[PDB]
Ligand binder design. Structure first.
Ligand SMILES: *C/C=C1/C(=C/C2=NC(=C\c3[nH]c(/C=C4\NC(=O)C(C=C)=C4C)c(C)c3CCC(=O)O)/C(CCC(=O)O)=C2C)NC(=O)C1C
Ligand SMILES: *C/C=C1/C(=C/C2=NC(=C\c3[nH]c(/C=C4\NC(=O)C(C=C)=C4C)c(C)c3CCC(=O)O)/C(CCC(=O)O)=C2C)NC(=O)C1C
Lengths: 488, 488
């Protein structure tokens, strides 16, 4: 099924990843309800474990220490824990839907979990712009965790993902500046990714180990939402195998409690991160998120400060010039400085004055009449002009988006901002690389995903941000206010 | 009924105000469905009008011009229109719920509707602060429209109204700085006030003239939402009569599409504003709203700019000092500069350091433990501390509100901001004046309304604004970020 993607319940796969073993106990960790087939192979146990008491299975010495963890749904990390037979394991212990889930993996005592991160964070803390934090992060994460490719994948308004930063081995293909459909990361995944900060895929071509029982007596599956060993969707694993990506590690970037995007790592060989390096990467993820949040806030405060200053400058000029209509005709191009636009236009006294990428002179009367019907003396905007006026499809390559600012309360005069269709402004330079395809078809390749997105945004501009509308509303109040001062 | 206030359907009173007459016609203004009893007295008509055709009743010459108005639910203002018998009327014409409503009133051709407003707006446009716009507006509106009292009544988070500005005759009582319950202006009214910019009460002791029919054949009343003659609730009219207020004119202040508050005018004698002065006041209302919106935005941008600068200054100090714990103990009082607070405290290394109005030393351990349970490494805040900790009622007169900023990701260390209970910070200086009371009791007086509000906010502080939380979150990321840099 490669449609209704949001359907698949990824949280309850009924499988885990080979690189560790999973024991699910009751709410109070007394009786083993479920286990992973490989529990035997790794712990050195014989036979079925389901019905045996936690104290019996793992040991009275270990089960005691694990009870003190849950005394804290944030998974408790217990590095280098000992079994009765002496073997040493790193243990992830969490409690979700009144089910205690214990994950075991071969132990790492070499790496330091705080020290590693403290140095990584130190290098991104002093970044003074969103672009500087982002650029350095991919490069940094690659050098440190040694993944063949690191992307920052940022989510657009429409749910589509743009690759805004990339560090990679020279040999590998670049996805920098390419967009991907909202469907490529469906809604239940983003819901899960807001819960699980960090995520591993040890092997995309690995054999997934089943959890027994898959479904229990009461007829409910084992929710592996907060289980780091949870096996990933076969749709995504095929997608990674088609890209020649054997292993994966993604970090959830959380800004203002939204999912802003992912730090996504690819490895061409199989790769297991140890509990300690996964804690470090998780901490870096949190700090990277916090800094990007504050840098985004500073940019918003700056963008608007800069627009306020521009309008004060223009209101001081309007005090000196007698003819305001004359001042606007000489000045209107300068408003393209407030709101990112490919063109700006002035419709004043049934006359049209254009600058940059605007619709054709003959097409404006239609537009001016239309805006004057739906505006209602407030800011009107759209990124899909042709959806509002079919006639406007002809010039979508020039002006696909329009934001309209009324400049007179009384008269029907407008300041019109325009944007080219997003595929025009597209800067990726080509996806010449051909990709091998598995059972499910050529849909599961970056080449097709990109082709799909490009159709989904045809005749459509870069949407107007909250900041573009905030500035536009402030410009309306400034222009309407000073146009009243010069009444006829 | 002086409870469940939101019940009363003020929009369909089945009455109008004496100072004009009302004719409701069908959707296309052909047949007179309803009229006000006084239609006869003012238009010079005899008998019932309900069933007679619009062309017959008002005239073919007039009904034609009225059809061209609805060719525009914004009421069309038609000043100095003539009837068949020669009489001259100002006419408000609107169409709501497929019912054309025509309001007539004695004509004013003396006042200029734009010129008056253009001068008023000119005096508020150059205001550079919310306090300066507000202060000048009451004073200005009083001098111009000549009302005995003008208030600006601002709505609080909890729906309560504060009187933030006042111009009045020396003899009259001051309501400056007094709050009023959310119930005093119920929800259906605010819903109506978002629709009707401006509102008149010609006489609070006037005899309301009934609309016939009150309820029609189809069993639906006449919606007078956009009718300027709509009779006001008898609850409010009694309230005004108890205040010695004979007439009223309120203006809806709309900021970011919210109802921010009202410019409320009181007159001790009866007072009808003419259509032209009502248009002017309506225009001023719009401009006053637009400017206050932009001044509010500038203040928000400034408040946060100022907090960013403060934290950068503090992060530069943290680079020089080795012991960060020492720097915070010396500096924490300075954070009271970021967020308006009556006290600030530092809980670091199980030690307490206080500055300003904070809870007692002995009470902090309880607080520090509590915050450390519900915080979850993010900013936690409340204006009703005693609702979270009953024990905290004892010191509500000192600290009724608390905002808590984590300063360490690892350790349980907090920066605690405090606010006194709102009745402490209360600056109104007394309501000695006694008020006469009508049939419905002493509830309908400012004295009682204020007593009611004062109980509704006991043990409660001034709520933490979006701006206080925005700054607090930015301070968390700054302090948590630099505390990681100085790991143990
Ligand atoms: C219709 C179903 C589809 C689908 C489902 C799906 N995708 C999921 C995760 C996921 N997808 C991406 C996409 C990319 N990663 C890349 O590196 C590139 C490179 C060009 C692309 C396009 C990513 C990053 C992820 C996140 C996986 C991770 O956390 O590492 C999932 C959720 C996986 C899970 O089981 O948790 C599902 C389901 N993807 C499709 O493309 C389609 C058609
Ligand atoms: C339980 C019912 C009550 C109630 C209902 C009610 N109030 C309405 C309007 C209204 N109330 C105020 C309040 C004041 N105005 C003042 O000047 C002062 C001065 C101290 C106070 C406290 C105001 C300003 C208004 C707005 C009226 C206007 O637009 O001029 C209404 C709506 C009236 C209508 O029919 O449109 C209703 C209903 N008010 C109560 O106090 C109570 C108990």
């Amino acid at each position: 099924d490669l449609t209704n993607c949001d359907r698949e319940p990824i949280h309850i796969p009924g499988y885990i990843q080979p690189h560790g073993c999973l024991i699910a106990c009751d709410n109070a960790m007394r009786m083993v309800l479920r286990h992973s087939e490989n529990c035997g192979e790794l712990l050195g146990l014989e036979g079925d474990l389901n019905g045996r008491t936690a104290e019996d299975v793992l040991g009275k010495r270990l089960v005691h220490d694990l009870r003190n963890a849950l005394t804290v749904t944030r998974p408790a990390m217990l590095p280098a824990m000992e079994t009765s037979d002496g073997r040493s394991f790193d243990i992830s212990l969490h409690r979700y839907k009144s089910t205690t889930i214990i994950e075991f993996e071969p132990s790492d005592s070499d790496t330091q979990p705080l020290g590693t991160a403290r140095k990584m964070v130190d290098r991104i803390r002093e970044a003074d712009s969103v672009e500087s934090l982002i650029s350095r992060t991919t490069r940094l994460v690659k050098a440190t965790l040694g993944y063949d490719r690191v992307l920052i994948y940022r989510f657009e308004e429409d749910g589509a993902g743009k690759v805004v930063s990339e560090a990679k081995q020279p040999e590998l293909e670049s996805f920098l500046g390419q967009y991907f459909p909202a469907s490529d990361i469906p809604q239940q995944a983003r819901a899960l990714y807001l819960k699980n900060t960090l995520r591993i895929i040890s092997d995309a071509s690995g054999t997934p180990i089943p959890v027994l029982p898959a479904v229990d007596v009461s007829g409910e599956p084992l929710d592996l939402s907060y289980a780091h060993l949870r096996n990933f969707s076969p749709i995504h694993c095929e997608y990674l195998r088609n890209m020649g990506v054997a292993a994966s590690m993604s970090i959830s970037v959380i800004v203002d409690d939204a999912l802003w995007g992912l730090i996504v790592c690819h490895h061409c060989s199989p790769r297991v991160l140890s509990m300690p390096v996964r804690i470090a990467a998780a901490m870096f993820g949190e700090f990277f998120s916090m800094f990007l949040q504050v840098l985004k806030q500073k940019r918003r405060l700056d963008t608007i400060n800069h627009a306020h200053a521009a309008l004060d400058r223009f209101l001081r000029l309007a005090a000196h010039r007698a003819n305001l209509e004359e001042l606007l005709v000489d000045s209107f191009q300068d408003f393209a400085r407030l709101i990112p636009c490919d063109g700006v236009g002035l419709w004043v006294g049934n006359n049209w004055h254009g600058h940059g990428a605007t619709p054709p002179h003959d097409a404006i009367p239609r537009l001016a009449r239309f805006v004057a019907s739906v505006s209602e003396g407030r800011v009107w905007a759209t990124h899909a002009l042709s959806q509002a006026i079919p006639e406007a499809e002809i010039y979508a390559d020039t002006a696909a988006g329009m934001l309209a600012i009324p400049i007179s309360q009384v008269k029907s005069d407008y300041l019109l901002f325009f944007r080219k269709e997003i595929v025009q402004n597209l800067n990726w330079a080509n996806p010449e690389k051909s990709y091998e395809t598995g059972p499910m078809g050529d849909r599961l390749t970056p080449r097709k995903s990109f082709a799909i997105w490009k159709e989904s945004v045809r005749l459509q501009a870069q949407p107007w941000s909250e900041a573009d509308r905030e500035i536009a509303e402030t410009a309306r109040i400034a222009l309407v206010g000073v146009a009243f001062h010069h009444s006829e």
